[PDB]
Amino acid sequence: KIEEGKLVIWINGDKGYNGLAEVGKKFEKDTGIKVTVEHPDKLEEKFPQVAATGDGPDIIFWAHDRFGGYAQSGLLAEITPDKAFQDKLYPFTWDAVRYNGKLIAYPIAVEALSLIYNKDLLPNPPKTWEEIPALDKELKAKGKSALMFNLQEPYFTWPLIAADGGYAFKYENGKYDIKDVGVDNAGAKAGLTFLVDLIKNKHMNADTDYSIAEAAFNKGETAMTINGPWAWSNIDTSKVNYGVTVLPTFKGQPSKPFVGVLSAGINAASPNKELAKEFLENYLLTDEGLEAVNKDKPLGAVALKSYEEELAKDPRIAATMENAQKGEIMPNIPQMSAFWYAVRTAVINAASGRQTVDAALAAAQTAAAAAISPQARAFLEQVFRRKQSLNSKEKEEVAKKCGITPLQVRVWFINKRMRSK
């Protein structure tokens, strides 16, 4: 589908989509072409599902880590800005959206998590994770808690897991080794054990999610939280007097948040590629365009040099970049999705007691390193249960929705049907 003559954009609900729509209005006013902005739930999972059949938005916004998978599946159109335009954004942001030699998206913002604390409840935030238990005990005696953050998404817990040595994929020569995962090494175990101990010792609740953590902090119930710039807006309206700073250290090591580059990709099936290019290059990626988005929900640090250097005057932005500096820009390779799913499961199981820390991370390593991820395998079985044979078109479709190779799909089905007698 995807109607030619207009632009449909998808951006996560925690971002300034209303601000983005304002940029869209400007675009429509100048060009006459309508821009509709939508914020579907689980949009990063839905995109492959719809784009696999040539449908979906013309433009998709998400951190660069999901884009290598999309590009590998041929769901993203190559972008080719002139050197003049590329010079307007930091070289490392273009690097983040380069896959197999091709730029596959326009960098927008550089996202990194930071420690957010209530200045009135804690004028001096802890420098180490180790201090949190004792700090929490004190606050509890006052009917308050020390720390609350989303424990359901590995994005928020990864900074601690990686602090003492945990890593996603090993960067050997000049590439990531998809078979060398570091979610089960000494550093990862130490990090996760500390997190589980916090929950075990009633310093945090295993079911605390994004909404719960945000409500408690903006209510003055907890002294600290971990989140990104997009959340500053709601805190401002809460009147809570907060500060944004470097994340606590662990075992004397800095927390290492995975840094994401919020980027805009163009659907390979879009019949509005030139219009998408014009919108992104001439309207959004301008000081005026980004400011409009920022006004709705803070983008944090950005890729556009001219705007980043103005934002740099803001201490919350310096804090964001300081944390970004301590962590690392995440890989954009296809396997990142399996990685995230693996850590998500491990943290949830370790925190609930379904698995010991060692058992949880052992399974995480296997899951993240698997040639066919558990998610992909599950999808394959669902399809197989309905049809044990697929033609070329169907195989291509399944692969795209799957985030796996067409040959992988083909051989899996063959192996699945093999018999001996």
Side-chain angles (χ1 to χ4, degrees), residues 116-126 135 138-139 142 144-146 216-225 235-236 238 240-244:
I116 300 177
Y117 69 107
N118 183 312
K119 273 177 157 55
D120 298 325
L121 283 297
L122 201 66
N124 295 293
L135 177 52
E138 179 189 63
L139 297 177
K142 305 176 181 178
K144 295 296 174 60
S145 65
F217 185 81
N218 297 181
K219 248 68 168 304
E221 289 169 41
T222 183
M224 315 180 106
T225 188
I235 309 181
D236 297 325
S238 82
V240 170
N241 180 46
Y242 70 108
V244 182

Side-chain angles (χ1 to χ4, degrees), residues 318-336:
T320 300
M321 288 306 292
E322 280 152 36
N323 279 309
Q325 183 171 61
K326 289 172 160 56
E328 38 185 355
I329 165 175
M330 49 191 118
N332 66 16
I333 65 175
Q335 297 75 195
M336 281 305 288

